[PDB]
Amino acid sequence: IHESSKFIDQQFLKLQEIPELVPVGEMPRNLTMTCDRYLTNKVIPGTRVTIVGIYSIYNSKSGVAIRTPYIKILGIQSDVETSSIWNSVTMFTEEEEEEFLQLSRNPKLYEILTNSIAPSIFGNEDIKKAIVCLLMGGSKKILPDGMRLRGDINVLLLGDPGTAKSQLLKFVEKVSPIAVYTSGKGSSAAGLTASVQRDPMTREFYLEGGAMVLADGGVVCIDEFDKM
Amino acid sequence: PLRDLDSEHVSKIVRLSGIIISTSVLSSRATYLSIMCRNCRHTTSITI
Amino acid sequence: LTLESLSNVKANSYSEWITQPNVSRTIARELKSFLLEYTDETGRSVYGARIRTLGEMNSESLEVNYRHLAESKAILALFLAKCPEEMLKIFDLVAMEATELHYPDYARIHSEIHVRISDFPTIYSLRELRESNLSSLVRVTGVVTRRTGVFPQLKYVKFNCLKCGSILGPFFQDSNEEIRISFCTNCKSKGPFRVNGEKTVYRNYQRVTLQEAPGTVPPGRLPRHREVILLADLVDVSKPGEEVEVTGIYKNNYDGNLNAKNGFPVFATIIEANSIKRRVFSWTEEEEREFRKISRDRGIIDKIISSMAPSIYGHRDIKTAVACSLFGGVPKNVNGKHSIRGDINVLLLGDPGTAKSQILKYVEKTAHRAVFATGQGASAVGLTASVRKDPITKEWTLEGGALVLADKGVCLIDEFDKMNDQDRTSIHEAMEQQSISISKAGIVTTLQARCSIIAAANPNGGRYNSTLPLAQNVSLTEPILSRFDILCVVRDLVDEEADERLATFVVDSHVRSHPENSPIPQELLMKYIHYARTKIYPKLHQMDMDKVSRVYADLRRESISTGSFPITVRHLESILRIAESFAKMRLSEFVSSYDLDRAIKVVVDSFVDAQKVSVRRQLRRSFAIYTL
Amino acid sequence: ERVFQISFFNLPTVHRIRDIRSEKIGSLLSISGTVTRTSEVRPELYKASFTCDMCRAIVDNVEQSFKYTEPTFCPNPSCENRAFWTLNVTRSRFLDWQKVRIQENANEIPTGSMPRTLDVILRGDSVERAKPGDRCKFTGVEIVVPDVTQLGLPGVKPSSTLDTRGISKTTEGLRSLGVRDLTYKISFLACHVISIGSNIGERDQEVFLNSLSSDEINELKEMVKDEHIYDKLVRSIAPAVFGHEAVKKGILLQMLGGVHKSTVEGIKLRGDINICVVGDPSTSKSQFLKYVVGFAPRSVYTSGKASSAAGLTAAVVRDEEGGDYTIEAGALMLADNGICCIDEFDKMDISDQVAIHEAMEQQTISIAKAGIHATLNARTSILAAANPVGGRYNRKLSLRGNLNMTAPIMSRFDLFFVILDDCNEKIDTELASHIVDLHMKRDEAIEPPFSAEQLRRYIKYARTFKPILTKEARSYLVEKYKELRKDDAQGFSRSSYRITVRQLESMIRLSEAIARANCVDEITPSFIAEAYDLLRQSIIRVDVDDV
Ligand SMILES: Nc1ncnc2c1ncn2[C@@H]1O[C@H](COP(=O)(O)OP(=O)(O)OP(O)(O)=S)[C@@H](O)[C@H]1O
Ligand SMILES: Nc1ncnc2c1ncn2[C@@H]1O[C@H](COP(=O)(O)OP(=O)(O)OP(O)(O)=S)[C@@H](O)[C@H]1O
Ligand SMILES: Nc1ncnc2c1ncn2[C@@H]1O[C@H](COP(=O)(O)OP(=O)(O)OP(O)(O)=S)[C@@H](O)[C@H]1O
Ligand SMILES: [Mg+2]
Ligand SMILES: [Mg+2]
Ligand SMILES: [Mg+2]
Ligand SMILES: [Zn+2]
Ligand SMILES: [Zn+2]
Ligand SMILES: [Zn+2]
């Protein structure tokens, strides 16, 4: 009787060893894991996790008595947390609020935020001021006619090689809450802008990826912007 | 490491690291299910 | 019974003879006497020492030599050769009792001792296994092609009964066939019993495909392959791609309804491995003292330069670049905000016949984590990260590519010029961010690619033209050319004496290699490079800043005056990184002045020789003080 | 008890693969064919030993005929049922078994039809007597094997149902019968395998001279003793071709080859000579390839556009849409320790050129397709024929500009024979006379110094030698390398392709081949001079426009 029965969620995860430490000519080995209740939907594919769990057995119907191992997850720890819109947190504690309010009344606030932008880079003070302004951005407006005015600022740095523009891009990628650093032709296997590809096991259209979309609400640092 | 998992770790708690390929869709498992006999109409509950 | 009574056989077959309890107990007693009393007439018991060593090392493997048993009891050696399975079970029990004679608490730790027979005399190739070798011990050589993962196979099988819930006793699982129980002995029922994995004990299992080594195959014949099953202790021993020699029992794999395609009652064959023998960057306490002894020599660095690629002659600056790339600098991250790369990228641009590929092969042999890749070739690891689904396994796997796979190591890219676009983008990201970002198949992540790159390229048109500068001789663009620290342009100009010595070297190499006919040793050198990479971490101090800043302006103003492509800050960083790499070969914790001068020499020579000849003539005379 | 096998041979007639008819099933026969696939040796259940399930006594020596059979006698009187048994694979007896696939010979295929294959099975001592790519004459029995794929075929497929006439039945109640299809394909079971030569007409020398009788070993000694033997060897190669003595010398040296050497580090030094023939249209460049395929053992012929990556190296193939994947030996392994003759190397696409220079680099073939990972032996000399870009050969352009073949392809060819057409009356008249004499006289117009069979015996004798460079040969070789590179330096861009070290290994290889041609154990400096002269004549000077 289904309208008087109670159910929980269960999820299959697939875990590989990290591709940095794999034998050169060998396939990276993987295990299936099962999680339930509040352990489901806690990690996205691609994240690096250490997981505590029971190493257990199932029989799948290659050897007279051969069993497939799996992991029953008891806990998941995320080593690094990816930056995205859904993963962004808007909650603040009162101590951080007080610290930011106390910071905002400093009369040399502009000077210290410009000095904090890439302290290892000699010169380019105007560029660092520009980078601070880019990090803040302007006010976005939505008007009664429906058309919107953007607040984001797009800055181009073009010049001779060896003038630390790539390091400025890297530091902006590090300091931004949401950021991606890509080339003009994209990444090694991550596209630029937006890619719509068919789903693997159900053959349905979905947004494959792309620098301009994963970095929504953030900064895309496009190195070698002329080749595109 | 993932390659040092042997048969001595079977049905034991192991801590192990890696990267995630895929997260499957959420399947619905049953915790409490009420059952009723087809013709006998005996009502029973199984808790899991 | 006696040995001479064991020589005579009464049963129909050998296996039925050994199956008898009296023959089994006689063989057990004789194996006990052999294990406890064998000496090599030198006053030492090698097997007692082996038992003590395996007990103190907490290992379940006992190596028993076949020639020792043959000299001691020849009939038991013949019995082992003919019927290895049950006699190995007997000698398992005998070796377990011999271990319990010394260590009485070893049974609770392991309860299983595997006997590994070594130096079996008969040698078989995989192409000559026949009908006579079934259920017999065979010693076969070959190359491992690929191996499966380690799976848990049931060893002590425990059941539970669905009628009463009682948990039954443990039963040994024979490796030949599945075991089943039909009685409960508590509720006296033949009901459905289920195996519970929490109280069942398992052994490790691996499946390894072995082919005949391609050197030994007859001409028109394909290399035969067999399949080898590795048990609990032998798992993950032999990596694929290496020549290994396996001793084991040759037997038939049983399958349901045989093969319908053949129409004949044909079985497949397996080898259950009894022993694995391989036909390491570990330094001992003496090895580090030897490293310190060889480092205190004044001319140590040059010896390392002379140790790079002995089969390659005359390319001293290329070998210096190889030594710098192999040792490498130190990466650093000041305050977490600003990162400076710490490994030397070397580009070998050369005409055909300058032996760049042999240098790449030498580095692949020498280095710790060396990954070989190429642009034009197909059967090699790719340079691009990917998410690939196996067509048969239907399993999605994340391949980091050769750049991620060479992390904390070296990636060697042969034929750097005719690369395609995706591989160029992968190299560009791997040298800029030292990482590779993937957004494929629902996987959005970044993989660390902190890898040094030693690339080889051919100039445009097949020759280097010294009249044109470097960028016009190579299809590589300016940003990818600027990322290399050492830029070795090698050209085969015609010099009579050089041609004579090179031809002499090559012809001598041929005449040494005929079948009818001060450098550091390679084994010491490889561990030396690993040690210096893993424990030194050199550092440069504050009072040398007045000379590098001086020579930086000295090259910059001359580059402005001459009008070549400019010297940037990255040449200074390349100087400071090559200095830290040269200081590692001395096992030195600090950077010296001669170290900096040698690094400045390397960088100046690498910058000058990539120029137009008009630029070369002025730059050689202006920078004569630093070239020395 | 030892199993015995009777092998019949010298049958009066040899049948084609397409002449196999159903009237000869269960009859002694002799067929011929070219072996394509060889399986590995597998055990076949000959004398099965069973144990009954409920009486549990062992019985042995059960006849096994093709399909798997279980005895129904059960001679112990303890139990009363017959069908249930269990096989004991340890106690039972097995024989060797191989399924080798053979294909119709190229001269036997009809006018428009494709070749059709046949699976012949070898048992016992006949196993592994056939190699991938050779012509074998199989004597055996035409047998018949169940085939399931004939279900969708048109026509009435025979079937078997159980006859129920003498069986008493009652309609008590509480009608099923066993019907099974009779669909089959013709197979062969051979007791004798002999390998006739793949030609139209063992490394140690002692086993070779033991094989020859007194008369032909005397003839071989007479050939060895002759002082003008090298000129006769050159003149005996490709008699239908007029002129082009340098190409004939190269072909002879390729058929001889150099020694294979392995250094202490582990790298391998190639003894195989790879030759590319480039030139103007209608210069008999394909006649050389025809002669090498029709003459040299272990030789295969391939066209450039009709090529493929899998067909030249190795193929991973699927049979009957099953889970099993097998390996087809490619053209490079069908010519292993022989010559792969590839006409129109220019028309070959880039992927196949990549897949073949990989097997020129490592002299091996790598397979990673599907679940099969394999390393394969393809040490093979390559005789390539290429046409220049634009059709005609431009004298003003270098060899690299005339050819679209890539630099890794070009770097491993020792000899580049550019054969050209020049219009003068004398040699055109003599060539025309030669061609019309060929058309008039067939074999009467061909008068070589040696016939094909004695040429092949001399080549196979000479390949046993392993020539060794002497003390003076070393210095004379390095002097020739010095003067050759000095000629490059003086010529500048006038040379077609510059001499590097690779030409020095090719010079050593050609010197070893010449020393083999004269049947000597040590390389004389005259052989060095001949190899250097041939290599110098390989490079032609680039014509330069006047300024
Ligand atoms: N003014 C500067 N102050 C501090 N460090 C600098 C300065 N200019 C260059 N560098 C350093 O020198 C290197 C220069 O690399 P980048 O200039 O960032 O490369 P880029 O030339 O800007 O980008 P390209 O044009 O694609 S090569 C980095 O390691 C910087 O840290
Ligand atoms: N300086 C040298 N010392 C020793 N052997 C050499 C030298 N130069 C060339 N060789 C030999 O010449 C051959 C050249 O082989 P490769 O290493 O493939 O040449 P390469 O420099 O890679 O040029 P490619 O193949 O056109 S990219 C090998 O047999 C080398 O051993
Ligand atoms: N120099 C020659 N000596 C003998 N026969 C020749 C010569 N040149 C041409 N022929 C004959 O003329 C015909 C030329 O055919 P092919 O050998 O196929 O031409 P080819 O040299 O291969 O040029 P392509 O590249 O195929 S257009 C054949 O019948 C040859 O026997
Ligand atoms: Mg940049
Ligand atoms: Mg090369
Ligand atoms: Mg032709
Ligand atoms: Zn009921
Ligand atoms: Zn029970
Ligand atoms: Zn019975």
C248: buried, middle or exposed (CB in 10 Å: 19+, 13-18, 0-12)? buried
Q: Say yes or no: CB of residue C312 within 6 Å of ligand 2.
A: yes
Ligand nearest to the CA of C482: 1
**Residue C275 dihedral angles phi and psi, to the nearest 5°:** -150, 150
> Is beta strand C346-350 parallel, antiparallel or unpaired with respect to C486-490?
parallel
* Integer Cα distance of D478 and C505 in angstroms: 10
**Touching partners of B (3+ C-beta pairs < 8 Å):** A, C
The ligand 1 atom nearest the CA atom of C569:
12
Question: CB of C576 within 8 A of CB of C548?
Answer: yes
> Is beta strand D85-87 parallel, antiparallel or unpaired with respect to D93-103?
unpaired
Nearest by Cα to C388 from D467, A120, A28: A28
Domain extent listing, chain C: 21-122, 123-154+202-279, 155-201, 280-626
Query: Would you call C135 an interface residue with chain D, using a CB distance cutoff of 8 Å?
Result: yes
Range list of H helices, C494-610 = 496-512, 522-535, 545-562, 569-585, 593-608
Beta-carbon neighbours within 5 Å of ion ligand 9 = D 52, 55, 74, 79
Residue C575 tokens, joined? 């100087």
- Given ligand 1 and candidates A117, A122, A167, A170, which is best to mutate, with the most ligand atoms within 8 Å of its CB? A167
Q: Hey, is D484 helix, strand or coil? A: helix
Q: Say yes or no: CB of residue D501 within 6 Å of ligand 2.
A: yes
Q: Hey, is A128 helix, strand or coil? A: helix
Task: Please provide the CATH number assigned to the domain covering C280-626.
Answer: 3.40.50.300
Q: Please report, in range form, the residues annotated as the binding site of A.
A: 159-166
* Integer Cα distance of C152 and C624 in angstroms: 68
Atom 11 in ligand 3: residue holding the nearest Cα: D284
Residues in CB range of A33: below 8 A, 6 or more apart: A12, A13, A14, A15, A51, A53, A70, A71, A72, A73
Ligand 1, residues at Cβ distance < 6 Å: A 121-123, 161-167; C 340, 479, 482, 569-570, 573
Cα angle at D417 between D537 and C495, to 5 degrees? Answer: 50
Atom 30 in ligand 1: residue holding the nearest Cα: A164
Interchain contact, A1 vs B34, CB within 8 Å: yes
Residue type, D291: Y
Query: Would you call B21 an interface residue with chain C, using a CB distance cutoff of 8 Å?
Result: yes
Residues before each break in chain A (C–N > 2.5 Å)?
61
The ligand 1 atom nearest the CA atom of C341:
29
Q: Is D in contact with B (3 or more beta carbon pairs below 8 Å)?
A: no
Question: CB of D396 within 8 A of CB of D544?
Answer: yes
- Measured between CA atoms, the residue of chain B closest to residue A19 is B19
**Residue C248 dihedral angles phi and psi, to the nearest 5°:** -170, 175
- As a residue count, chain D comes to 547
CA distance D193 to chain C (A): 16
Assess whether the region D14-42+96-147+183-197 and the region D214-544 belong to the same CATH fold.
no
Residues in CB range of C319: below 8 A, 6 or more apart: C305, C306, C308, C309, C312
**Strands, E assignment, chain B:** 13-23, 27-36, 43-47
* Integer Cα distance of A99 and A143 in angstroms: 34
Question: CB of D311 within 8 A of CB of D380?
Answer: no
Query: Would you call B10 an interface residue with chain C, using a CB distance cutoff of 8 Å?
Result: yes
Find the Cα–Cα–Cα–Cα dihedral A131, A136, A141, A142, rounded to 10°.
110
The 8-class DSSP code of residue D450 comes to: S
Residues before each break in chain D (C–N > 2.5 Å)?
174, 201
DSSP string, D129-166: ---TT-EEEEEEEEEEEE-SGGGSSSS---EEE---SS
Bridge partners for A77 per DSSP: A50
CA distance C252 to chain A (A): 12
Interchain contact, C378 vs D358, CB within 8 Å: yes
A161: buried, middle or exposed (CB in 10 Å: 19+, 13-18, 0-12)? middle
Nearest by Cα to D533 from D483, D496, D464, D495: D483
Residue C586 tokens, joined? 């001395």
User: Taking the CB of residue C153, how many other CB atoms lie within 10 A of it?
Assistant: 21
DSSP string, C36-104: HH---SSS--HHHHHHHHHHHTT--EEEEEHHHHHHH-HHHHHHHHH-HHHHHHHHHHHHHHHHHHH-T
Query: Would you call A193 an interface residue with chain C, using a CB distance cutoff of 8 Å?
Result: no
Interchain contact, D478 vs C503, CB within 8 Å: yes
Resolution (in Å) of the shown entry? 2.9
Q: Give residue D241 CA to ligand 3 midpoint distance, Å.
A: 8
Question: CB of D195 within 8 A of CB of D126?
Answer: no
Beta-carbon neighbours within 5 Å of ion ligand 5 = C 357
Q: Is B in contact with C (3 or more beta carbon pairs below 8 Å)?
A: yes
Residue type, C33: S
**Residue C84 dihedral angles phi and psi, to the nearest 5°:** -80, -25
Q: Give residue C481 CA to ligand 4 midpoint distance, Å.
A: 12
Query: Would you call C385 an interface residue with chain A, using a CB distance cutoff of 8 Å?
Result: yes
Residues in CB range of C393: below 8 A, 6 or more apart: none
Q: Give residue C255 CA to ligand 9 midpoint distance, Å.
A: 23
Query: Would you call A59 an interface residue with chain B, using a CB distance cutoff of 8 Å?
Result: no
Residues before each break in chain C (C–N > 2.5 Å)?
279, 517
Tell me the technique behind this structure.
cryo-EM
Q: Give residue D452 CA to ligand 7 midpoint distance, Å.
A: 93
D441: buried, middle or exposed (CB in 10 Å: 19+, 13-18, 0-12)? exposed
* Integer Cα distance of D383 and D364 in angstroms: 18
Nearest by Cα to C576 from C551, C558, C559, C608: C551
* Integer Cα distance of C184 and D181 in angstroms: 45
- Given ligand 3 and candidates D282, D341, D387, which is best to mutate, with the most ligand atoms within 8 Å of its CB? D282
* Integer Cα distance of C8 and C24 in angstroms: 14
Residue found under tokens 């390996």: D327
Ligand nearest to the CA of C318: 2
| Superfamily name and number for D214-544 | P-loop containing nucleotide triphosphate hydrolases (3.40.50.300)
Nearest by Cα to A69 from C216, C151, C563: C151
Topology (CATH level 3) of domain D14-42+96-147+183-197 = OB fold (Dihydrolipoamide Acetyltransferase, E2P) (2.40.50)
A161 → closest Cβ in C387, C403, C478? C478
Assign domain C21-122 to its CATH architecture: 2-Layer Sandwich (3.30)
**Residue D154 dihedral angles phi and psi, to the nearest 5°:** -70, 160
Question: CB of C555 within 8 A of CB of C571?
Answer: yes
Nearest by Cα to C570 from C491, C478, C489: C478
* Integer Cα distance of D326 and D317 in angstroms: 5
Residue D359 tokens, joined? 């097997």
